[PDB]
């Protein structure tokens, strides 16, 4: 699930830090317009970071495992027999008879691709990369975290007393969280009805989060200023 | 590199989007304390999300793998040798002689350890996970979250105006993005001269959307109300 993976971590982060910082500065009468700008201002500087977060770190991993499969292969040239020692140990430490491991090895010395395959299969993990899935990767990312953080600013945008709009944004982004939180469980091994109430709580402890640290600036302001 | 890795996207998340909200709110002739206000609801709602995010992420990985850990050795009693052949595909599929392979399927038969854990090691990854790295996963990636953070909020505690302090904060941060930039690299395969580069460059994209942002909605507004 590589592409439902990086939709599911860009939503959770832009459904419940823009909620919650609208949340937040609406407690601590902020003008709506106000709470606008901050949020969508985060929205959109929190999807570059979440995307391009994404692609440095697909990019690297991606130009990293290429470089070691080439590292790896020139070990097998100037000392062939280090790279085999290598590849013995991944079979012996499963616990195979020594009668049946050695004929293996002699097969894999005369070709290359399939006793490096297996052997970096074994050992360094699966670290061939699906080039067009690294850049497929921040997009995807980028666009559920914007999507995320446009719920919560919604009513702000037709609400322009934010202490009446706060109220609209609670009960939208809580319906979002369980249904999107019932929406990460339908596409994993755990229960959706779990994962709803469990998006649902993360988005009511940073709402508060943001809350308390909200007034506790603003608490020598007689107005918001 | 679990621990090195969990603190590398706690700190990027951190230093850019707080950094990038800031000066967007500053451009906009916001006063400097409602900069921090929304900067730390950011912070805070900010390090919850992340941090949370990466606890929901390892607990469910933790569960998930340690459930089909015991649904798989289940599928070996009820039809032994269909989970013979799933395993027998493994071997085949990486050019082994029929003379070869056979004697090992027989060995495994016998003590189902060795056999299921080689098998799923080559199937479903490395799947085993350290349940105190699943809970010590949340925690430094908030802590790094906060911390990345409160870098572009110094000089606005320091500084009242805040076109006067966001002048601070854009080399502070830029300093800060070019350190644990080049920092990602002498722990990373990839040059940290270029990711230094690369961490100072998504700061300065994401701190111009904000600003941009922060700018479209002001554009009606005589002063920042
Ligand atoms: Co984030
Ligand atoms: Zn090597
Ligand atoms: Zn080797
Ligand atoms: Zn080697
Ligand atoms: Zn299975
Ligand atoms: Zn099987
Ligand atoms: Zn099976």
Redesign the pocket.
Same mark, same amino acid.
């Given at each position: 699930g590589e592409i439902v993976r990086d939709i599911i971590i860009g939503v959770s982060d832009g459904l419940t830090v823009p909620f919650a910082l609208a949340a937040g500065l609406s407690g601590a009468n902020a003008s709506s317009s106000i709470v606008l700008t901050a949020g969508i201002a985060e929205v959109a500087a929190g999807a570059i970071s979440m995307g391009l977060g994404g692609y440095l770190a697909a990019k690297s991993e991606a130009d990293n495992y290429a470089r070691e499969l080439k590292r %790896?292969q020139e $070990?097998i040239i100037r000392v062939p027999d280090? %790279?085999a020692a $290598?590849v013995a140990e991944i079979l012996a430490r499963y616990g195979i008879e020594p009668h049946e491991y050695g004929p293996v090895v002699n097969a894999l010395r005369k070709k290359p691709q399939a006793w490096l395959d297996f052997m970096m299969k074994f050992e360094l993990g699966l670290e061939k990369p699906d080039p067009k899935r690294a850049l497929q990767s921040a997009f995807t990312i980028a666009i559920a975290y914007v999507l995320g953080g446009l719920v919560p600013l919604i009513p702000y945008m037709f609400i322009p007393v934010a202490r009446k709009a706060v109220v609209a944004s609670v009960i939208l982004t809580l319906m979002a969280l369980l249904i999107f939180g019932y929406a990460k469980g339908y596409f994993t091994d755990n229960k959706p009805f779990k994962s709803a109430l469990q998006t649902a709580l993360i988005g009511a402890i940073a709402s508060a989060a943001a809350f308390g640290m909200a007034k506790a600036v603003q608490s020598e302001n007689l107005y918001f200023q």
């Open positions: %790896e $070990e280090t %790279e $290598e």
